[PDB]
What we know:
Structural class of chain C: mainly beta
Distance between the termini of chain C: 59 Å
Helix content of chain C: under 10%
Number of helices of chain A: 0
Helix content of chain A: under 10%
Region (Immunodominant HLA epitope recognized by the CD8+) (chain B): 13-21
Region (Disordered) (chain B): 20-49
Oligomer: part of a larger assembly
Protein name (chain B): Spike protein S1
PDB class: viral protein/immune system
Region (Receptor-binding motif) (chain B): 2-49
Amino acid sequence: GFNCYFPLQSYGFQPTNGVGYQPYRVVVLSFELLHAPATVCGPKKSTN
Amino acid sequence: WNSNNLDSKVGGNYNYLYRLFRKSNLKPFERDISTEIYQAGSTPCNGVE
Amino acid sequence: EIVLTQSPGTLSLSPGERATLSCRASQSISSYLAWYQQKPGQAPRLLIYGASSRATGIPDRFSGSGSETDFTLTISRLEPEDFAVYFCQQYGSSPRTFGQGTKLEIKRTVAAPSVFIFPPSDEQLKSGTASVVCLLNNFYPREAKVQWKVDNALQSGNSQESVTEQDSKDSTYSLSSTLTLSKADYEKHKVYACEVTHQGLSSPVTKSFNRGEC
Amino acid sequence: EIVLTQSPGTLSLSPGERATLSCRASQSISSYLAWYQQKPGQAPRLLIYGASSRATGIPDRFSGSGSETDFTLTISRLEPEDFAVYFCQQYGSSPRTFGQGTKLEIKRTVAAPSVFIFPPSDEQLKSGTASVVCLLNNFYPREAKVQWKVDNALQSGNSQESVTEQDSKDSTYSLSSTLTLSKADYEKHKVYACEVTHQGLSSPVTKSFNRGEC
Amino acid sequence: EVQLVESGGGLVQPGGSLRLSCAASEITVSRNYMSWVRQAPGKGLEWVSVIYSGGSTFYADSVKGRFTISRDNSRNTLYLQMNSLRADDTAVYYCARDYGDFYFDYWGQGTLVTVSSASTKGPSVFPLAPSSKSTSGGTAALGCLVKDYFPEPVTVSWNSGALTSGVHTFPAVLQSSGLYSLSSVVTVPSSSLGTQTYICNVNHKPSNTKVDKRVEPKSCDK
Amino acid sequence: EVQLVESGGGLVQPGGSLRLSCAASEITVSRNYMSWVRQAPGKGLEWVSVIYSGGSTFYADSVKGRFTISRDNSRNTLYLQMNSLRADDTAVYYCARDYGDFYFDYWGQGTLVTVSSASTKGPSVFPLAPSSKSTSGGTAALGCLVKDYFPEPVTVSWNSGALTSGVHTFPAVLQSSGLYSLSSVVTVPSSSLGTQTYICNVNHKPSNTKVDKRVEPKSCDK
Lengths: 48, 49, 214, 214, 222, 222
């Protein structure tokens, strides 16, 4: 109610809308380098 | 060193000359010997003082 | 930066009818406009949430309409309390902008001016500059046209004029105009007159006086 | 830095004659000096450079000379406008500087002033302070003498004089003195007189008025 | 209920500085989005800046590094400082709160801001003697002139605002001379024209000058 | 012919700052030597600083760490900036182009600068009505009085400068209150005294205050 707002607000999206306000999928990749065993490595490398 | 006894004249030694106007400073060891007339305003000089 | 255009330039209508306020933006959006009211000399007040959501403190007569780029405001059953100017602002992103405004006028009936012309005071003449004052009162339309004539020669271009907002009680207007000249120029001619043209009159009415009449 | 010296401290010559000005410096300049003219309330103007290089816009009447820290300027056939202060400018080092200056005056003839009195105005008394001014205009020389007499008593300590500047066309001075009073002292005292002596006057002249004249 | 009360503003010569402030009646300011906007006549509103509930700020491009914003949560008051005030920025500025994406819901009374190299000048008053035609009827229209003042506005009053009836005061005008002017008219019965004592009060705040002029029937044949 | 329009000047308190400037009507400021000189009554005249055509700078030791010169090519305008003055610096500063070995060839008219913690004050003007006696002749003298202002100077004009001959003005003088006072007088033919009324226009630019007062014979036999 008055001066009592839900902390969240919804979005509204329609195919007619402009590109700027169209929904987008976002992915963020972060890399960790600690004094710890490495778990992420590059792809295959091989020669005949 | 001093050059009075060698370059001074009673009637006036007028051979020695120095540059006075230029849009920009000379870079180190850069030599300018241009004698183009210097324009102070919008009026072109056309080589006439 | 996204620019808005409010339309029409002015709004002139009688109470009890429907209002229509159209607005256009430079760049197409989706439900990212709003409306702001302002009775002159007061605090602007927020009208309409988004394109069609109405604030709680605002009666049902209002309605907003929006599109990709065209957006129009609609109010029905016009009332005297509604006489004001109307503004558009963008709650989208740019960062935010606004519109040029539009004024709403409440119409009852046409009334001709009350015209009276007053000579310069003694203090003005003592100071070396002379001026002539013409006053129009309680008229509708606001589009009352006033012109000055000196020795029957038109001199309407020696003036700066301002006109009051609508009178809530009488649904009319009043205008202030001043014709000012130097004392020598004021002495050059002999008779000073002012022409007023208005809709409520079958013809423009002119009042005049002679300089020698003090 | 290097300091310059100018002589005379004052030079006064009549029209049509030839004036001479000499400048001296602590260390030599090797003929790089220059003369500038500045009339009161005007910007300085270039006259002559070095020993004898006159400026473009200056007439042939101007001519200077010198060498070895002793330098002289001479002007022939003096003309009325030539009244001004004059300045010599240094070339010997960085920084530059220039001397104190010299004022040259013209002598034409002696003429008596015109004496007027002006009472304190109503706005002054409303402010709570009254003042009296006596004006002496268009006379020669500068050294005019004026005195104030209050109720037949010599009030020499409550007045302030003011001096004009030499009008080139006429070659005459003008002087103003102001007597300042408190409201109570103004109302208590009634008779106000000013006594003026001047060389252009055959006899001393006295002007007076009564406070009752309003 | 919830009210915003501001102060400050005014006129300073170009290149000056000016700080503004505004307090809120019931909304704490601390937990709310607060913004500043300004209105220039015949040109409209304009965004200036705003403060988010997280304490972050942002401003228009034209004023970046020039216009500042601050808060005092202890007093539910908003603080704004302006430096490097320039030309044509003279206007009325407002404090405003939002809900959702900058819906300026509640508004203060607005504060004038003025910039010009010119200084303050009090107004001048010239009364108008009514004509015989103007008194034709039960009531007559009498007025007076106000001109040669700066900066606007000027207050015109009778008995310090007791009457509020029968008064027409015309909108102000800026002259090519650099000063302002305006006019006002009052309506009184044609009979009291000779008995009731007429006094008009002219009030100009930036000059702090209060002007009182009588209004008397006089005559045109004189 | 060759003209340089000056700007700036005015009152500043100690410990403050101010930016002065002057512009060129026709000449290329970017391509010639430019210098400031400050002139003070009763103290003399001095050389301040200079910019060489290569943009190099050079000062007088008296203002190091307190004065700075530069030049804006975007507007063909020379500029000047001030730090932490002294009362001694009270003077009128001038802009002037010199060439080579420092002939100070063309000059501007100069602009005064005043330092004091004392605040600005508007002037008051008292007109003088000519006497009936002075009308007995070819010409008569008309004048006015301006006083109780701060600081000097005050520009005066009669009929907006339409007249040229017969105008005499007096230099300002210090009041024991710290203010100044001055006067002016204009000479005119006798015939139009009862026909033409002459009005003096006054400018106190450092306060940017203008006052206009009339001069009329009225009647002095009283």
